Design a protein around this nucleic acid. Structure first.
Length: 70
DNA sequence: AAAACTATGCATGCTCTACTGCTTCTGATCTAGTCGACC
């Protein structure tokens, strides 16, 4: 059910996608609302960062969490 | 006729109880946006 999440039917809809997940990450990690990391997570498609990937939200979150995680 | 004791009025401070104005918290409303799933 984790290798093929698209075929899951027992679990209901999470109700969270890229935007809500970004907001929740900003809230829980206590990141600044107007800081660079929050703006990168919210507007994760704008390539203004010029680093990592400009379309992948998972990679951006990974880069953000790298210095803050065990 | 002179001196001592007492009554009543008034000043004085402190303490306590209503009324007006400023600041903050909550509720209610509207507007904008996100997500599930279909096609």
């Amino acid at each position: 059910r984790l290798i093929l999440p698209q075929l899951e039917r027992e679990r209901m809809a999470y109700g969270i996608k890229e935007t809500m997940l970004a907001k929740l990450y900003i809230e829980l990690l206590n990141l600044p609302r107007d800081g660079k990391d929050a703006l990168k997570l919210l507007n994760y498609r704008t390539p203004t960062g010029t680093h990592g990937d400009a379309g992948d939200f998972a990679m951006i979150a990974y880069f953000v969490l790298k210095p803050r995680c065990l």
